Ligand binder design. Structure first.
Ligand SMILES: *[B]([O])([O])[C]([C][C]([C])[C])[N]C(=O)[C]([C]C1=[C][C]=[C][C]=[C]1)[N]C(=O)C1=[C]N=[C][C]=N1
Ligand SMILES: [Mg+2]
Lengths: 233, 244, 240, 204, 231, 235, 212, 195, 222
């Protein structure tokens, strides 16, 4: 049993017709102090998987080292390491899910919420969640922390069920993700303007975008707001 | 591997004997003779130190007779270092019993415990046995004065008079000849010294080549006193009995 | 820990360490067991090479395991103490958990099991001891007599002997013991037991020990004079 | 609840001219209930005397433990243990149970057989040695005993005078404590004679 | 000679005799054949009986839905090693949601057998194994030796008189590798291969044991009247 | 000396092969499986007439649906029986059902090779394990100290085994009745035994689906012996 | 839970209710609170459902092993003590059990042992265990005799559970009856309280407080 | 359990122990014997937490019976009491201590004297002319302080014990369902069947 | 302080027919007042014609199902591909649950299938392993809403025959698979209305001698 010290906020994601999109901001908070402003919380594994992590950053760095080691270990005595016997998103997730549930069972959890986004060998979209309790679930849209409360509602308007996935393009999906990130910056007190976004497509592969910013913000209406009720000046 | 160098200390011969026990007994047969004689009013322990020197500090020396508690003592025959390992274990066992039951340990129970330890080294562990034979002289309120002996096999037996170490065959014959049941301590003292004087490999039996002890109820009223004899006191009892 | 396999098979399918343990039993003083109609008697040889012995305090050959069961033996004396101690502990443990004293068969099966375990365990040699276990089951008047040996096999006997010159006394018992009509009384059973030992013992003085066990925890050891009277009567009938 | 005041009791020791004195009450109780009036708290191993206050099971256990250890000492050393040496043995033995201690308040008293010098010492429940010249106190009425000793005591008292001083220190301290009393014993100790005196006191 | 008392001792020519003696136990064992195409992999095993009243000792063991082996030598040692494979296949599935690769299964068997050849007290395994399987890179056939040596092959045979079947497969190499999408013909080739190792005795209904795994075919064992079709 | 787990140049474990020689010295045990049940019979072989023969226990119950006969160093069999009984009862606890005869046999055989430098040597006893289950019906297994077990329609172990096995070769057929099997075991035991066969030096037992495992009374066996004598004198 | 057992002329009567609850929620009305350990031993179940079920079916495995090893039926004393010694090992860990071990052997006759998760093991003639034990005790103690017929004893047990089923909120459902004799136990049916209450009320003239 | 009493007279020790066993709400039994014979001339009564009491008593019983068989000799009451005390003194610093208080009544055949030892669960031993555990002593010690003598007969001891039980039945809130009385003397242990 | 347990909501229902058995469960997965997934399968085919569901804390639920599926696999390996009967599966699950008696799987487990006589079977477990064969059982969040309805409409409790007035009970006539599916659908529709953790979708697994069939139905998504 511990308490989280340096923490990362929401990770958001969704499926679209040819793949999956995932995003997360670049902040490492120390309570109410916005301590570290250059923290990468999306960690790619090969060219077919991106693991997004929220919660305790020291535990995130530990998980990052486990995944790095997993790639090394998979290559050992494996002539098809970059082909048929490469790491799949499903393999990477199940490993993490095993570790998370084992650690909670020893009463010493990795204080994180994790989303594994990727594309399988047969082109199928992979998107699944796991957290400090070892709880797992899948959905056309997935989000952690504040994202669950604010992002999911917006992303579910695009893809409400399974049959909406083939009808959703990469442009429409990315647009929805970027808008959700703006909304989280308006409303989450532990978020930052700077974020990273990753697309995993079955045709065009892994596209990792760094140093993105929330833009097209509405603040002008603030000038008209005066007092808390009766005040006019 | 390591099997190559294992002597296998705990095996039977084709005849059903324990090799190492038999060879340990052969070792003990070259040790200085120790005699125990039980009387109606006490017990005598006499023992011969092995070929000493004039430069040996006798008054502070102890190789034969050891105190286990206030009521029980032992005479040693064999490897002195091996004996001290067992003696310290026996001293502890007596104290454990005293702490548990708040009574002094009965002689036989102490003897059985030490004998069981010796037995273990002949059945398991792959270690050599202790090359030691003990004569136990003790008193308790159940059986009174008691003499026992134990050997490397872990077998123990009770005695009226007994010898261990060198020339036991000759010594046991002499004791069997002159011993009587109604004998007293002073008479037993004389018998013990006379027996050693005849069985000794030395030219003459002197005070500097002996260790002597008595367990007497010759203590003021109903209680038992252990007396480890001093060099001068061994010299006096040798003159009294008419050996020197 | 010392793990060396001392008891192992040989090309002809024998375990020599177990067989050499039987040779130690052959060397041991003779012990005999005879069961009558309402009793069991355990006879034991005392070698008279050891005089100046204190018979009060010297370890007796027959040992009580519980108030209703006894154990005698032939072989290594030091080894027998270990089996006796284990048996005494198991007897009290059985009373504690089952709320009933051990049957004679159960106690035998335990002692036999311990002996067997020492024939296929690393770093240990077999016990150089064979035992005769006798007594009466709780609330039962049928006599019980069992034998064990170093290998760990055990079985029930109408009458049996173990130790040195046991071949001779077994010869005697096989012709003198009738199954259809066993020794009806204590006297007849003790007499047959002393007779069987007199084939081997030498002098009938302090060389024979007798212990009579009857139902309902009635165990007593006969004295020198009581046994001497049997010795006297046997030879006076023999002079004819 | 507090282990050191379930059973109750007290011990006091004093030095005099070529002599020492050690005394204790005889009560054993279960809180308010008085159980025994024959529970002596002073023991001796050879010429070294040990008083022990506190939890009674530990008083008994430690006595048995120090009898055990002083008997082995004597067999190996071929001499009786001295007060100075025994004091160190008590301290060592208590500190080995640092984080699971015996709930006791030991007091050592005796005369060194070689130098003839009078010796007293006290301990806390985990081994700290208080080696006072004048007096040592222990138990549930230790505050009371401190007050009595500090006023009544003077140095170089003769054995028969020292008896009166220590006896009055114990008796009047015990009478101001609910968990002490029910009889008392006083040991007067000289180099080669020891007198034991049972005191007449109020039985409430 | 003087250097065969235990597995921890090299001979003067650098040989390990205890390992070689373990290899000898395989040669005494009954013949078993393995072969594969691109779609399927087949095991054929000649089972051995004690006498006419006895049953015929089973030769083939299933390790997973996609993997299994046939044995030749000490059967209890095959049970230990097959149990280890079952566990390793199972660890891969539970932890990584991943079917164990046949090549990696061979590597694990090699390393397990090796530890028994370098340490004092233990002994080498006294059995040879033929592992077949279908994984993400298609059909596979492996040959395990208790020296530790594992080898991937198109076809092979181990046991007594296994040289006859091994030569036949060496001739038929170009034919049977092409038998794709036809399980019965691939088994026929395996039954014809094991027939080259027979003397005096012939393939009966309770003598023959066949196993197959493939693209849309779980590892299944055929015994009894199920193999009468191929006799 | 040499390792306990050493291979011979022929590829056999020395100790296992030596334990098989000890089993050849043991008393005879025979088992015959039929569609009406499995029969188990043993030679008691008392070393002396004073030995009470009914205390010789060479046929043993493992569960209600599984019995067992032994041959060789019979003391070694006690821990094997204990394990078998525990395995049978434990499986019933875990699965609320009877355990398969083959699975029980496999569990016993797993102990066999657990020896080295675990126990110090292999078992010096062979077992005939007979039973019934719903899947494979009436079965008879031969469990060796090598860890190997064969199923048998009929099997003999012990000192008179190869002579008895040759006799079982001719006599066994798939339509044998239980009564026919009982007499057949008695016939073959009488053939290979040193002493003359009677109800006191030989013991019969069977396992049926209805009644389970039963050791036969000396009175019941005595009748079957008398029935055997008459039918042999009939031609 | 209401479970009882009592010794009498015709052996032992065992009677139990059928209800299982989680708080105020009635989880089951069809629970088997009697365990058939063997044809001669019965165990009752009160407290934690799992603890009782698990360890009493486990007890049956230990009893079967005893009679395989000793070629003899296990005594009620020995069987009860195996269970009490086991739960004593777990003392403090939080097991929750109140059980009667009931049987009949030659050496003992009809015997009942109360076994408890605190380690308590008591031999006795009458026992009632569970939340509704006090209600069952009232009927038993006023009507119990040694000289009862198997028919009358069975009814007294049935009636005593009914009394507790009525008043105790955590008891009810149905009544399972067993009768233990020299030749083993004999099941005497499941009796729904919803039909038994009205039947007993009418025939017996009892429960005049309730309207029917 | 509840009330256990002991009194040592001229030539015997008398132990009295309540018969009730109470599982919270109900009295499950009214004939419970809260004692075990450790040896022919030594009896131990006990009271404390459920389960622990019997488990401890039977464990001590087994150990003393084992000693008796091994040595063919009966331990003195003093020796048995010291063994019991050590077990409880060991127990109090265990993971889960034995919550058991005991009285040990024995007749020493060597000294020809009765002996009564009171030991609590901490391992606190005292030899006494009369003793009690729990709330029993609060009522009974005043009576015993007044009436007791060292030279009393066994019959006088039983009468003084009846006066103790009568006081307990008058002033104690719990119904302990009477007591089982047992006498320990030179002839062994016997139960007074009418009390 | 760290809390190793959580509540993922959901509700499950098992009904045993005369020659069939159904095990149903909603597909919604939640924490607190949020929806994790509208379609997360909760009822699983475990092989050997056995279906299983472990409702409550999903991590423990997935762990248990995973370990039981594993037990089926090893049962085949160890006992010559023998079919694991529903009664044997039930006892095995008791030991899996009781094995963690002092750190329990926080789930309500139900299995369904056919017994060895071909008749429909449902078994029900508590978190620490106590179990019982039943004709009818609901488990999880809305169990308290559904069970009373099933007492009434499956076992005809408190129902009597017209004209007799409480004297003659309604006879316990057997229900077809079409009739059972109607009762399951109505049970979940009703539970969805009044329980916030129930909704999104209903997945039913039907077990017969022919095998395991699946049926899916939409539920309200609010
Ligand atoms: B009985 O009331 O003790 C009863 C018998 C049990 C063996 C089935 N117990 C329960 O119903 C307990 C609750 C309880 C009620 C009253 C007293 C003590 C305990 N119920 C359970 O253990 C249980 C188990 N699984 C589900 C629901 N309830
Ligand atoms: Mg809803």
């Amino acid at each position: 049993t511990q308490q989280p010290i340096v923490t990362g906020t929401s990770v958001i994601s969704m499926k679209y017709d040819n793949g999956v999109i995932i995003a997360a901001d670049n902040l490492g908070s120390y309570g109410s102090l916005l301590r570290f402003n250059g923290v990468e919380r999306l960690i790619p594994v090969g060219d077919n998987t991106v693991v997004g992590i929220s919660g305790d950053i020291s535990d995130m760095q530990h998980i990052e080292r486990l995944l790095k080691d997993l790639v090394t270990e998979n290559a050992y005595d494996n002539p098809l390491a970059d082909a048929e016997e490469a790491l799949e998103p499903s393999y990477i997730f199940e490993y993490l899910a095993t570790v998370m549930y084992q650690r909670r069972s020893k009463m010493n959890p990795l204080w994180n919420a994790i989303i594994v986004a990727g594309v399988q060998s047969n082109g199928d979209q992979f998107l699944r969640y796991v957290n400090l309790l070892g709880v797992t679930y899948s959905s056309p849209t997935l989000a952690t922390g504040f994202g669950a409360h604010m992002a999911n509602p917006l992303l579910r308007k695009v893809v409400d069920r399974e049959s909406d996935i083939p009808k959703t393009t990469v442009q429409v999906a990315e647009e929805a993700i970027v808008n959700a990130m703006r909304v989280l910056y308006y409303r989450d007190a532990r978020s930052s303007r700077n974020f990273s976004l990753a697309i995993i497509d079955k045709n065009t592969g892994l596209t990792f975008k760094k140093n993105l910013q929330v833009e097209n913000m509405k603040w002008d209406f603030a000038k008209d707001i005066k007092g808390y009720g009766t005040q006019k000046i | 591997g390591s099997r190559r160098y294992d002597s296998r200390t705990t095996i039977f011969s084709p005849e059903g004997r324990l090799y190492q026990v038999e060879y340990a007994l052969e070792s003990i047969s070259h040790a200085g003779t120790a005699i125990g004689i039980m009387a109606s009013d006490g017990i005598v322990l006499a023992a011969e130190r092995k070929v000493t020197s004039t430069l040996l500090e006798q008054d502070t020396s102890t190789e034969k007779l050891y105190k286990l508690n206030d009521k029980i003592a032992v005479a040693v025959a064999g490897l002195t270092a091996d004996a001290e390992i067992l003696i310290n274990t026996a001293r502890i066992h007596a104290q454990n019993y005293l702490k548990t039951y708040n009574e002094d340990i009965p002689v036989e129970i102490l003897v059985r415990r030490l004998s069981d330890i010796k037995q273990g080294y002949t059945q398991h562990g792959g270690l050599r046995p202790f090359g030691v034979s003990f004569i136990y002289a003790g008193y308790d309120d159940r059986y009174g004065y008691q003499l026992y002996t134990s050997n490397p096999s872990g077998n123990y037996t009770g005695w009226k008079a007994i010898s261990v170490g060198a020339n036991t065959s000759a010594a046991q014959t002499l004791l069997q000849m002159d011993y009587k049941d109604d004998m007293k301590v002073d008479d037993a003292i004389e018998l013990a010294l006379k027996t050693l004087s005849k069985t000794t490999d030395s030219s003459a039996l002197t005070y500097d080549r002996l260790e002597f002890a008595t367990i007497r109820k010759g203590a003021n009223d109903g209680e038992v006193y252990q007396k480890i004899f001093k060099p001068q006191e061994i010299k006096d009892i040798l003159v009294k009995t008419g050996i020197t | 820990g010392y793990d060396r396999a001392l008891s192992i098979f040989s090309p002809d399918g024998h375990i020599f360490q177990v067989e050499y343990a039987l040779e130690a039993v052959k060397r041991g003083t003779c012990a005999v067991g005879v069961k009558g109609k309402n009793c069991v008697v355990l006879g034991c040889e005392r070698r008279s090479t050891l005089k100046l012995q204190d018979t009060r305090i010297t370890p007796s050959k027959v040992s009580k395991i519980d108030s209703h069961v006894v154990l005698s033996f032939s072989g290594l004396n030091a080894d027998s103490r270990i089996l006796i101690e284990k048996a005494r502990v198991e007897a009290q443990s059985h009373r504690l958990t089952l709320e009933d004293p051990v049957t004679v068969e159960y106690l035998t099966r335990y002692v036999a099991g311990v002996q067997q375990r020492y024939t296929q365990s690393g770093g240990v040699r077999p016990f150089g001891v064979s035992t005769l276990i006798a007594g009466f089951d709780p609330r039962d008047d049928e006599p019980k007599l069992y034998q064990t040996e170093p290998s760990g096999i055990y079985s029930s006997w109408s009458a049996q002997t173990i130790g040195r010159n046991s071949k001779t006394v077994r010869e005697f018992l096989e012709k003198n013991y009738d199954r259809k009509e066993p020794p009806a009384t204590v006297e007849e059973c003790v007499k047959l037991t002393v007779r069987s030992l007199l084939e081997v013992v030498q002098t009938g003085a302090k060389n024979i020990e007798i212990t009579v066990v009857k139902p309902d925890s009635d165990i007593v050891a006969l004295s020198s004079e009581e046994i001497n009277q049997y010795v006297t009567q046997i030879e006076q009938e023999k002079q004819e | 609840s507090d282990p050191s005041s379930i059973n109750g009791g007290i011990v006091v020791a004093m030095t005099g001219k070529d002599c020492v004195a050690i005394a204790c009450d005889l009560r054993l109780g279960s809180q308010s209930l008085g159980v025994s009036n024959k529970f002596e708290k002073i023991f001796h191993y050879g010429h070294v005397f040990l008083g022990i206050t506190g939890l009674a099971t530990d008083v008994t256990t430690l006595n048995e433990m120090f009898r055990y250890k002083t008997n082995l000492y004597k067999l190996k050393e071929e001499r009786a243990i001295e007060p100075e040496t025994f004091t160190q043995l008590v301290s060592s033995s208590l500190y080995e149970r640092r984080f699971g201690p015996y709930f006791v308040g030991p007091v050592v008293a005796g005369i060194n057989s070689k130098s003839g010098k009078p010796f007293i010492a006290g301990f806390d429940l985990i081994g700290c040695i208080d080696e006072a010249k004048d007096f040592i106190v222990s138990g549930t009425a230790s505050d009371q005993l401190f007050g009595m000793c500090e006023s009544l005591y003077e140095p170089n008292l003769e054995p028969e005078d020292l008896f009166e001083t220590i006896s009055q220190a114990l008796l009047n301290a015990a009478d101001r404590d609910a968990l002490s009393g029910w009889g008392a014993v006083v040991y007067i100790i000289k180099k080669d004679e020891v007198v034991k005196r049972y005191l007449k006191m109020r039985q409430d | 000679n003087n250097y065969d008392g235990d597995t921890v001792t090299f001979s003067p020519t650098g040989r390990l005799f205890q390992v070689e003696y373990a290899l000898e136990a395989i040669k005494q064992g009954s013949v078993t054949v393995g072969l594969r195409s691109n779609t399927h992999a087949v095991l054929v095993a000649l089972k051995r009986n004690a006498d006419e009243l006895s049953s015929y000792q089973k030769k083939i063991i299933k390790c997973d839905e996609h993997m299994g082996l046939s044995l030749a030598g000490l059967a209890p040692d095959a049970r230990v090693l097959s149990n280890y494979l079952r566990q390793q296949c199972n660890y891969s599935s539970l932890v990584f949601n991943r079917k164990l690769a046949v090549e990696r299964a061979g590597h694990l068997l090699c390393d397990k057998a090796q530890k028994n050849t370098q340490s004092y007290g233990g002994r080498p395994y006294g059995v040879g194994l033929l592992i077949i399987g279908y994984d993400k890179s298609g059909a596979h056939l492996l040959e395990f030796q208790p020296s530790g040596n594992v080898t991937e092959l198109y076809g092979t045979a181990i046991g007594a008189r296994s040289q006859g079947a091994k030569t036949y497969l060496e001739r038929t190499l170009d034919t049977f590798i092409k038998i794709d999408g036809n399980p019965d013909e691939l088994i026929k080739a395996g039954v014809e291969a094991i027939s080259q190792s027979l003397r005096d005795e012939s393939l009966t209904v309770d003598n023959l044991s066949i196993a197959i795994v493939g693209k849309d075919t779980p590892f299944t064992i055929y015994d009894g009247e199920a193999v009468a079709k191929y006799i | 000396d040499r390792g306990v787990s050493t291979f011979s140049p022929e590829g056999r474990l020395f100790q296992v092969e030596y334990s098989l020689e000890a089993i050849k010295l043991g008393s005879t045990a025979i088992g015959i499986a039929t569609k009406e049940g499995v029969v188990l019979g043993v030679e008691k072989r008392a070393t002396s007439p004073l030995l009470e023969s009914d205390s010789i226990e060479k046929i043993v119950e493992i569960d209600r649906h599984i019995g067992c006969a032994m041959s060789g160093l019979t003391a070694d069999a006690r821990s094997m029986i204990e394990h078998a009984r525990t395995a049978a009862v434990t499986h019933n606890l875990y699965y609320d059902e009877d355990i398969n005869v083959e699975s029980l046999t496999q569990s016993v055989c797993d102990l066999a090779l657990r020896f080295g430098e675990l126990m110090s040597r292999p078992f010096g006893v062979a077992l005939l394990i007979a039973g019934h289950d719903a899947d494979d019906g009436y079965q008879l297994f031969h469990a060796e100290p090598s860890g190997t077990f064969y199923r048998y329609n009929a099997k003999a172990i012990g000192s008179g085994s190869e002579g008895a096995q040759a006799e079982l070769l001719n006599e066994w057929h798939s339509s044998l009745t239980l009564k026919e099997a009982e007499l057949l075991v008695l016939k073959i035991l009488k053939q290979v035994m040193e002493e003359k066969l009677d109800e006191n030096n030989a013991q019969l037992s069977c396992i049926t689906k209805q009644d389970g495992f039963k050791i036969y009374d000396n009175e019941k066996t005595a009748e079957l012996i008398k029935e055997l004598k008459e039918k042999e004198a009939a031609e | 839970s209401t479970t009882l057992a009592f010794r009498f002329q015709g052996g032992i009567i065992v009677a139990v209710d059928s209800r299982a609850t989680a708080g105020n929620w009635v989880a089951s009305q069809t629970v088997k609170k009697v365990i058939e350990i063997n044809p001669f031993l019965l165990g009752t179940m009160a407290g934690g459902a799992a603890d009782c079920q698990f360890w009493e079916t486990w007890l049956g495995s230990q009893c079967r092993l005893h009679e395989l090893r000793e070629k003899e039926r296990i005594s009620v004393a020995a069987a009860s003590k195996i269970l009490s010694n086991l739960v004593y090992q777990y003392k403090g860990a939080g097991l929750s059990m109140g059980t009667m071990i009931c049987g009949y052997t030659r050496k003992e006759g009809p015997t009942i042992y109360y076994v408890d998760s605190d380690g308590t093991r008591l031999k006795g003639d009458i026992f009632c265990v569970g939340s509704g034990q006090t209600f069952a005790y009232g009927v038993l103690d006023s009507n119990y005799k040694w000289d009862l017929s198997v028919e009358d004893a069975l009814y007294l047990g049935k009636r005593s559970i009914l009394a507790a089923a009525h008043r105790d909120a955590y008891s009810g459902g149905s009544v399972n009856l067993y009768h233990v004799t020299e030749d083993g136990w004999i099941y005497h049916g499941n009796h729904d309280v919803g039909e038994l209450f009205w039947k007993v009320k009418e025939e017996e003239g009892s429960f005049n407080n309730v309207i029917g | 359990m509840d009330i256990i009493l002991g009194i040592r007279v001229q030539d015997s020790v008398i132990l009295a122990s309540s018969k009730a066993v109470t599982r919270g709400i109900s009295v499950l039994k009214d004939s419970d014997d809260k004692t075990r014979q450790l040896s022919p001339h030594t009896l131990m009564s006990f009271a404390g937490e459920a389960g622990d009491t019997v488990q401890f008593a039977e464990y001590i019983q087994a150990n003393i019976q084992l000693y008796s068989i091994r040595e063919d000799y009966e331990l003195s009451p003093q020796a048995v009491s010291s063994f019991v005390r050590q077990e409880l003194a060991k127990s109090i610093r265990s993971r889960r201590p034995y919550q058991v208080n005991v009285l040990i009544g024995g007749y020493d055949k060597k000294k020809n004297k009765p002996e009564l030892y009171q030991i609590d669960y901490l391992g606190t031993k005292v030899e006494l002319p009369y003793g009690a555990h729990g709330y029993s002593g609060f009522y009974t010690f005043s009576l015993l302080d007044h009436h007791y003598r060292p030279d009393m007969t066994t019959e006088e001891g039983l009468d003084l014990l009846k006066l103790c039980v009568q006081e307990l039945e008058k002033r104690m809130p719990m119904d302990f369902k009477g007591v089982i009385v047992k006498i320990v003397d030179k002839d062994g242990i016997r139960q007074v069947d009418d009390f | 302080q760290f809390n190793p347990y959580g509540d993922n909501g959901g509700t499950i229902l098992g009904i045993a027919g005369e020659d069939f058995a159904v095990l149903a469960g909603d597909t919604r997965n939640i924490t607190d007042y949020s929806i994790n997934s509208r379609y997360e399968p909760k009822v699983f085919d475990c092989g050997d014609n056995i279906v299983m569901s472990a409702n409550g804390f999903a991590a423990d639920g997935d762990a248990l199902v995973k370990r039981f599926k594993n037990s089926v696999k090893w049962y085949h390996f160890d006992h010559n591909d023998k079919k694991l009967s529903i009664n044997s599966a039930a006892r095995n699950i008791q030991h899996l649950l009781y094995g963690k008696r002092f750190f329990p799987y926080y789930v309500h487990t139900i299995i369904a299938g056919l017994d060895e006589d071909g008749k429909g079977a449902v078994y029900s477990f508590d978190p620490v392993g106590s179990y019982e064969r039943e004709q009818c059982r609901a488990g999880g969040a809305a169990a308290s809403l559904i069970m009373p309805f099933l007492d009434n409409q499956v076992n005809f409790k408190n129902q009597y025959e017209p004209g007799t007035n409480g004297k003659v009970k309604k006879p316990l006539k057997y229900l077809s698979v079409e009739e059972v599916i109607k009762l399951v659908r109505d049970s979940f529709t009703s539970a969805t209305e009044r329980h916030i953790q129930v909704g999104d979708g209903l997945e039913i697994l039907i077990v017969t001698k022919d095998g395991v069939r699946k049926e899916f139905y939409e539920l309200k998504r609010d």
